[PDB]
Design an enzyme around this catalytic site. Sequence first.
Site, PDB file in Angstrom:
ATOM      1  CG  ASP A 170      -2.351   0.787   0.808  1.00  0.00           C
ATOM      2  OD1 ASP A 170      -3.003   1.154   1.667  1.00  0.00           O
ATOM      3  OD2 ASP A 170      -2.362   0.993  -0.370  1.00  0.00           O
ATOM      4  CE  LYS A 191      -2.826   5.134  -0.567  1.00  0.00           C
ATOM      5  NZ  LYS A 191      -4.536   5.009  -1.052  1.00  0.00           N
ATOM      6  CG  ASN A 209      -1.487   4.854   3.098  1.00  0.00           C
ATOM      7  OD1 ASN A 209      -2.081   5.526   3.469  1.00  0.00           O
ATOM      8  ND2 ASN A 209      -1.568   3.834   2.169  1.00  0.00           N
ATOM      9  CG  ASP A 243      -3.784   1.868   5.147  1.00  0.00           C
ATOM     10  OD1 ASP A 243      -4.191   0.836   5.672  1.00  0.00           O
ATOM     11  OD2 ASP A 243      -4.604   2.491   4.469  1.00  0.00           O
ATOM     12  CB  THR A 301      -3.400   3.232  -4.655  1.00  0.00           C
ATOM     13  OG1 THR A 301      -3.977   3.203  -3.339  1.00  0.00           O
ATOM     14  CG2 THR A 301      -4.235   4.432  -5.538  1.00  0.00           C
TER      15      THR A 301
END
Length: 340
Positions: free
Chosen positions: A156, A158, A161, A174, A191
């Site tokens: 995850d 990005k 986060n 996250d 994402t």
Amino acid sequence: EQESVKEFLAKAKEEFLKKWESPSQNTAQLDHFDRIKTLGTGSFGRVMLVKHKETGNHYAMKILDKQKVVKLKQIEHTLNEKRILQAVNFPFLVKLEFSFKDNSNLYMVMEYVPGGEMFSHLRRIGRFSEPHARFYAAQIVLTFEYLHSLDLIYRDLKPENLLIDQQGYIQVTDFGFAKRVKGRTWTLCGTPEYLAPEIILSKGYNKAVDWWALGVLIYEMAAGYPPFFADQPIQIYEKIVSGKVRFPSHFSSDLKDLLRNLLQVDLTKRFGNLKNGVNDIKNHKWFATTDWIAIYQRKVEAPFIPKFKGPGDTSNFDDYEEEEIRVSINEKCGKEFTEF
Ligand SMILES: CC(=O)N1CCN([C@H]2[C@@H]3OC[C@@H](O3)[C@@H](N)[C@@H]2O)CC1
Ligand SMILES: CC(=O)N1CCN([C@H]2[C@@H]3OC[C@@H](O3)[C@@H](N)[C@@H]2O)CC1
């Protein structure tokens, strides 16, 4: 490998496994805290700033609605998230302080990081200089070296986060898609802009997807926008699988070389996933000025200290509609969440 790294990661795995095998449970309850403000929302539920009524300490409390977790088919992912978070320990990972559940919700109470998301600072400044991007990238490299050595894939990465702390260092948050995986895994999650080609193509994939995502992150930090951008996911996916990228002329030649090796569509050729593992990244010319030990020890002066007034300041987070935290008089989904 250096003896220091080898013996560090051996001890890290021993300590992770002991907590993994015997997870902590039920270490606080909701009425021990006062609710202050909503810090963010998503399909997962909400995150609220709370204050412990006795100690006065502030925390970020992630609240998940059990019935919604079930409907969105996130039971296993949510159990992964809490079991991993309670077992890890690394300077650049958010720290889970308490967890508990009630008739309606699951709760993960984390140390609050008041500097806000990297995403906000990146969009406010426009792009980060290469030294600034490199400081954050080095922390992600070390964090993935730690996580991968525990057989954990993160999935995850990005800018939203990555939180910036009071010393200007990163805290990765996250763990909603994090998983313990020896070998390959198959779930479509993450994402669109950050997905590796092998995820988009529905293959069995491995920890190499995190190193692809690092390439996307470094490009976005240094350019101000991600390398595969389009109006709809289906057009982003076409660009990701193509094997072509365009670099701004302001990128250094060393940065372009690193990115061609992280954004390598053939996972068997991608940096991080070769014989030398993470050392192909740490020893790359773009990182030649990076003091890996000093970064880990938090001895490097950060490029940027976020402005905030104190541990209760919410000014670096944005404003969300304030809704009730309801707890049913009847237990919901108790069987599904027994281990939480
Ligand atoms: C540890 C801490 O301080 N935290 C925990 C994580 N949250 C979330 C919040 O919910 C969705 C959005 O904001 C998300 N990008 C962010 O990571 C911010 C505050
Ligand atoms: C129709 C709509 O979009 N609404 C309704 C009213 N809310 C306010 C009101 O004040 C307190 C509480 O209801 C809270 N939900 C919010 O701030 C905004 C969203």
